[PDB]
Ligand binder design. Structure first.
Ligand SMILES: C[NH+](C)c1cc(NC(=O)CNC(C)(C)C)c(O)c2c1C[C@H]1C[C@H]3[C@H]([NH+](C)C)C(O)=C(C(N)=O)C(=O)[C@@]3(O)C(O)=C1C2=O
Ligand SMILES: [Mg+2]
Ligand SMILES: [Mg+2]
Ligand SMILES: [Mg+2]
Ligand SMILES: [Mg+2]
Ligand SMILES: [Mg+2]
Ligand SMILES: [Mg+2]
Ligand SMILES: [Mg+2]
Ligand SMILES: [Mg+2]
Ligand SMILES: [Mg+2]
Ligand SMILES: [Mg+2]
Ligand SMILES: [Mg+2]
Ligand SMILES: [Mg+2]
Ligand SMILES: [Mg+2]
Ligand SMILES: [Mg+2]
Ligand SMILES: [Mg+2]
Ligand SMILES: [Mg+2]
Ligand SMILES: [Mg+2]
Ligand SMILES: [Mg+2]
Ligand SMILES: [Mg+2]
Ligand SMILES: [Mg+2]
Ligand SMILES: [Mg+2]
Ligand SMILES: [Mg+2]
Ligand SMILES: [Mg+2]
Ligand SMILES: [Mg+2]
Ligand SMILES: [Mg+2]
Ligand SMILES: [Mg+2]
Ligand SMILES: [Mg+2]
Ligand SMILES: [Mg+2]
Ligand SMILES: [Mg+2]
Ligand SMILES: [Mg+2]
Ligand SMILES: [Mg+2]
Ligand SMILES: [Mg+2]
Ligand SMILES: [Mg+2]
Ligand SMILES: [Mg+2]
Ligand SMILES: [Mg+2]
Ligand SMILES: [Mg+2]
Ligand SMILES: [Mg+2]
Ligand SMILES: [Mg+2]
Ligand SMILES: [Mg+2]
Lengths: 100, 92, 157, 94, 120
RNA sequence: ACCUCGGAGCAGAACCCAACCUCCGAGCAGUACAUGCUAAGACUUCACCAGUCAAAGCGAACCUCAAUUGAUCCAAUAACUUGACCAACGGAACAAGUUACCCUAGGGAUAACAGCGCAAUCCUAUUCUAGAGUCCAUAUCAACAAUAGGGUUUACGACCUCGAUGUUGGAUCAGGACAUCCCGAUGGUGCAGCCGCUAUUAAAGGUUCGUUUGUUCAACGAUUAAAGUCCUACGUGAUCUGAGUUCAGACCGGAGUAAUCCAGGUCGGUUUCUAUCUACUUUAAAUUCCUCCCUGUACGAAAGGACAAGAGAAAUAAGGCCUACUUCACAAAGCGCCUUCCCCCGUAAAUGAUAUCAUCUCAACUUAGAUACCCACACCCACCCAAGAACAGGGUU
RNA sequence: UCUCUUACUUUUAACCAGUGAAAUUGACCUGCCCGUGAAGAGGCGGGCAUAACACAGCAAGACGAGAAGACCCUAUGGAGCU
RNA sequence: CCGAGCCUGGUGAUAGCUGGUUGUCCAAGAUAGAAUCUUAGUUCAACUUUAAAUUUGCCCACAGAACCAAAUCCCCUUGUAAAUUUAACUGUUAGUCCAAAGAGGAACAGCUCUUUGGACACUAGGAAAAAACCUUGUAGAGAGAGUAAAAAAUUUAACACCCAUAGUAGGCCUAAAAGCAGCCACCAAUUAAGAAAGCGUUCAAGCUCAACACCCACUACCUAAAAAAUCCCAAACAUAUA
RNA sequence: ACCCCUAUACCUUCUGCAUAAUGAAUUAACUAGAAAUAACUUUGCAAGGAGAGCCAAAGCUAAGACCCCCGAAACCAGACGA
């Protein structure tokens, strides 16, 4: 089964809190063939708002999306046509959460 | 010091359009000016060609702009000439 | 090599330079904002009960006193009609400060306990104190007068 | 002790290269030059309907000059003078 | 596959902070481009090489005047990564016939019509 | 296995686009009998050949289908017309095997050996904690899975070499790595002791002889402290062998009409080189086993049974010498004799802050923790020598 | 034969004298380690070493010499046999 | 040198195969494919060269190109100067890496196969040496000058103290299963303790946590390896104004 | 003169050779591009041209300028050899 970055692998609910699932869910996610993490609703929304906050308060004048979409320095000769939509956060099957 | 020369406006290469590169190298002892140098003659010819190209492009774009203005005036006058040569009758 | 590999593929050097240029720069604060500048109501009404009621107050140190010894000492003091209160210092000390027993304030520090009554039966409180020798009888007050243990023994005899 | 398998800069296993400060500064300089190019291209003078025919005469006359040269390609003249000056190779004193 | 690049009108819409960063009046635009090639056409596509040849920028660091018209702008938009574009400023106006032999372009992009080689 | 033609994907949107790439088909059928003639303009399978559409006009009337096919010559026929699974489908009119008895021109454009690339396969370490271990994940073993490393196997690629890079094992000499078989040090144990298991550190030193087999391997006999894993062009054939393997002879079984062949067995079968260049040709600290006593002590219910300290006796290795023995004899040798000396780091403790306890400390801090050899130097014609290829060296009183 | 090799004689050898070849040879003022590279470097990169020149010996390297590979493939190249 | 002797002649046999091919200087000049007893070759096309004739050739504005992503086709301006046709032929038609979209293989290969685009098979500088990465191209002399690309950064694990009686060996099941084998419920006293979160017991018994008090205050950086074979490999240096 | 700095012999072959791929000790001599159909250029004459034949809706006649070397195993004929 193909699995892409940012896809929930399994979902859990019930009369419990995060840490209780977080133990064995981290145990399973470490053993997965890709990078994986145990998230909650609040944790997932926290990561998304942190990512948009980092994109907003980035002090670098130059960004991968701006350079790629404007074809600055003729960089699309070494880039991929899918990098225009990945915006430098993806490299093959790998996702880099530290890129903005 | 190319960046500093650019900031002062004195090119970047000190051999570019300075008095140091454009003044005559020598003259006769009694005071007669030397015949002009080959590089300076070539630079003056290139600058004359550059200035003539500037003049040609400027006046060509200006002439095109006034030509477009005149075409717009002709279009508006043919639009505004909308007098009915005959007067309406019948149900009026 | 394919576009997707099991290993992190080596990038073209211009793309690597592009990433190293377009890395994220966090905002830098200027003068470092680190370097820049319940139970209380219930505990209050119960202490109101035991201070405007309950004339005789004795404050002792809450010695460890294993649980069977707690219950038996409590039950002797209860056959002889005084009570053991345990009320915490964090709600008791400011109550003294705004309720005038500030001379009794500097004694409620550390482990503390209250032997409290409406009948002044100091004789067994002190003979239970001699039965258990490691019990100080820190202080307290009789008829709204602050007394030390010498005053308690004088009032007893 | 440390060998890169095969050739250094090609293949599955390459010798790693890392970005230097001066290379980053060079790229930043070129990026600034291009942002300024973006601005000066972002402001135009005329529009397409205004420029529709403003240089047709000059382009036509330049192409007519090119046609005139390409048509005027043709062999050159020959001279009695040149042949009789080749006669001069036996010009002795006396 | 590597193809030509379509460049957004969004990056070619200017902004006010861009105007005061590079001081230039949106109304009354500048009339002529000073274009100067500052990068080789080697290791570049053939269409970019051809457009460099069309614009006349074969020799590097040799400035050239061009019209600030949309067609020339489209060519410079294709080849914008190999060139530097400046506005041609005329402090004392367009050259005339009597001052055409005493011109200089200068590094500031100001075509002066009178050139003395004398101190101010 | 395929060879020609067509449809779909790869090849998403003008055209085109390969793979011994993924699927589906074709070598016709049915209707008509103007399915007659002729003629602008076009398309075109990337050439040509071939193929495709068609206005108008004459004459009548009032084709479906995707591929559904074959050139020239020649043959048949009065003529019109018609002839190949020419399917190797741009088709030679008509021709098979075998060669180790082989030959020639070449090819590292192309295989076998070796190197190189890669790590599917192989090997190791760690993470996770199911499970086993009376209980107990973590003394020990370990599923599913994850992360990383190695380049010893079997492969895969065809990058140097086919105007030669000689080959399997064995002899000889070994260089190196440590992922340690033994000897050294230490931690844990389901470690009472002896024995063990597991982990850390350690590459100075060592790691046997035989029967069968060409064997590497493997089985077995006898030991030993141990009988390590690998790399070195599967180290080493201008140092050797040629038992095996793939030249020419022959036999057996099988295959084939036969020639002949078998990734089957068996008997036999030429191993050249006078060293030009690089490199090198005397760098003195040794390990191990056994015996005694400690001691039948510690330990242990008993059975069993140490570690330190010390003494002796050997063996090997290195260096050397002939007194005797022995080969022998103004001498060279071993089978004989003499000598052989430092540590090594894993960890265990004390004081003591960050963190007024404690804490062995990438806190400051404390403890466990070499000498020898050589060394002078135009007597030299010549002679002798325990010195020596020549040269050199020692003696000549 | 070997454990396990030793001693002696002859030839060879080395030196002196006379005579005097052959294969080989792009030019060489011809070192070591690691890396690189047509993927195994005396000659390239980084480091190390380094007065010059004979004579004897060795065979690890010069992918050493010899023989336009004796195995494999190719050629609309041959030949022998059935 | 007998799988068919030797010599002479046909014979200068033939060779899609190897080797070789001799003065100076300049200029243009790099590989879509189809057939083929063909893939070691050749013919046509394609590219290339020369000489002529003519007029448009590249870049492209809007509108236009089908139902079941990057882009392209077409294309007036515009910037430029090439293009088509005619005549005459040779030679290339055994291809490598890099970026991108894919296919095969192991989402192996300096692997194989297509496409788009670079570079190499031509110069120079850089990444250590260096084909294919980056910078740069049009040629000479100079003991002038401004620049291009262009030098890797990182160093990780301290975590509390004190305290604990009891309705009850809650009920059922079981020999007992007592908070802790499995089930229902989960109340309730002390100031404050779960009909018990881990251990631990055949079951019991025991000891930790959550709870009182106590008090400065939970102090809380949320992170993580190592191996191979001749000999580690520039020397080094934290602090003088881009 | 060396010492300093820079500099990976040549040819052939090939995608690519310092390559450890080929050839070469060195010198002297010898040793390898032959031609038609057409075209192009320059003359002569011109509805004709060429010293019969041939070509001709500007052609005809004349000239110039364009196509290598070595090498097999083989096949056949006639001799000579026990
Ligand atoms: C060395 N021997 C075992 C041999 C081996 C092979 N085969 C190999 O190359 C096999 N080598 C491998 C194992 C594949 C690496 C061989 O192929 C040969 C030979 C021998 C030669 C002998 C030749 C001989 N001459 C040239 C010395 C000769 O005169 C005769 C003769 N009888 O007249 C030959 O037969 C001879 O030419 C020959 O045939 C040999 C080989 O072919
Ligand atoms: Mg390499
Ligand atoms: Mg066609
Ligand atoms: Mg019709
Ligand atoms: Mg065929
Ligand atoms: Mg065919
Ligand atoms: Mg045989
Ligand atoms: Mg041969
Ligand atoms: Mg191999
Ligand atoms: Mg278990
Ligand atoms: Mg290949
Ligand atoms: Mg070979
Ligand atoms: Mg050779
Ligand atoms: Mg170790
Ligand atoms: Mg070997
Ligand atoms: Mg050898
Ligand atoms: Mg043979
Ligand atoms: Mg025999
Ligand atoms: Mg030999
Ligand atoms: Mg040498
Ligand atoms: Mg002699
Ligand atoms: Mg090279
Ligand atoms: Mg090497
Ligand atoms: Mg060499
Ligand atoms: Mg010698
Ligand atoms: Mg050889
Ligand atoms: Mg050969
Ligand atoms: Mg053929
Ligand atoms: Mg044949
Ligand atoms: Mg023949
Ligand atoms: Mg020939
Ligand atoms: Mg040229
Ligand atoms: Mg063919
Ligand atoms: Mg061929
Ligand atoms: Mg390849
Ligand atoms: Mg090759
Ligand atoms: Mg060779
Ligand atoms: Mg060579
Ligand atoms: Mg060859
Ligand atoms: Mg006879």
């Amino acid at each position: 089964t193909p699995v892409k970055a940012g896809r929930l692998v399994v979902e859990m609910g019930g009369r419990c809190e995060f840490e209780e699932v977080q133990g064995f869910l981290d145990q399973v996610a470490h053993k997965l063939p890709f990078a994986a993490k145990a998230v909650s609703r609040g944790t997932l929304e926290k990561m998304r708002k942190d990512q948009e906050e980092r994109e907003r308060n980035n002090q670098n004048p130059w960004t991968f999306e701006r350079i790629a979409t404007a074809n600055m320095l003729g960089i699309r000769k070494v880039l991929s046509p899918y990098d225009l939509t990945h915006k430098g956060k993806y490299w093959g099957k790998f996702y880099m959460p530290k890129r903005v | 010091g190319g960046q500093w020369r650019l900031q002062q406006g004195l090119a970047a290469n000190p051999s570019g359009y300075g008095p140091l590169t454009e003044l005559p190298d020598w003259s006769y002892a009694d005071g007669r000016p030397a015949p002009p140098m080959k590089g300076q003659l070539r630079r003056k010819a290139e600058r004359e060609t550059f200035a003539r190209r500037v003049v040609l492009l400027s006046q060509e774009m200006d002439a095109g702009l006034q030509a477009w203005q005149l075409r717009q005036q002709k279009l508006q006058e043919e639009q505004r000439k909308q007098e009915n040569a005959l007067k309406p009758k019948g149900a009026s | 090599s394919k576009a997707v590999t099991r290993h992190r593929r080596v990038m073209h050097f211009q793309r690597q330079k592009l990433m190293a240029v377009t890395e994220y720069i966090p905002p830098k604060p200027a003068i470092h904002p680190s370097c820049l500048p319940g139970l209380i109501r219930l505990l209050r009404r119960e202490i109101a009960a035991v201070f405007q009621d309950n004339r005789m107050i004795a404050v002792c140190q809450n010695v460890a006193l294993s649980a069977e010894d707690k219950l038996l000492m409590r039950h002797q003091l209860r056959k002889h009609k005084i009570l053991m209160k345990v009320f915490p210092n964090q709600v008791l000390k400011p109550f003294l400060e705004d309720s005038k027993y500030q001379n009794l304030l500097p004694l409620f520090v550390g482990h503390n306990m209250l032997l409290v009554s409406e009948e002044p039966k100091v004789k067994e409180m002190v003979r239970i104190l001699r039965t258990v020798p490691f019990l100080p009888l820190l202080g307290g007050c009789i008829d709204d007068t602050i007394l030390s243990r010498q005053g308690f023994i004088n009032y007893s005899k | 002790r440390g060998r890169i398998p095969g050739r250094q800069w090609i293949g599955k296993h390459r010798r790693p290269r890392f970005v230097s400060l001066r290379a980053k500064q060079n790229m930043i300089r070129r990026l600034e030059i291009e942002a300024e190019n973006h601005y000066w291209l972002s402001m135009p003078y005329m529009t397409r309907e205004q420029e529709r025919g403003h240089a047709a005469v000059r382009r036509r006359e330049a192409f007519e000059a090119i046609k005139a040269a390409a048509t005027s390609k043709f062999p050159p003249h020959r001279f009695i003078a040149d042949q009789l000056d080749h006669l001069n190779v036996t010009k002795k004193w006396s | 596959k590597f193809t030509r690049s379509r460049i957004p009108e969004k990056v070619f819409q200017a902004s006010p902070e861009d105007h005061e960063k590079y001081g230039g009046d949106p109304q009354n635009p500048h009339k002529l481009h000073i274009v100067t090639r500052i990068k080789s056409t080697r290791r570049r596509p053939y269409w970019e090489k051809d457009i460099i040849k069309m614009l006349g920028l074969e020799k590097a660091h040799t400035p050239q005047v061009h019209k600030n018209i949309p067609s020339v702008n489209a060519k410079l938009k294709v080849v914008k990564h190999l060139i530097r574009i400046k506005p041609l400023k005329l402090p004392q106006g367009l050259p005339a016939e009597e001052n055409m032999s005493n011109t200089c372009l200068k590094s500031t992009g100001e075509l002066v019509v009178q050139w003395h080689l004398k101190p101010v």
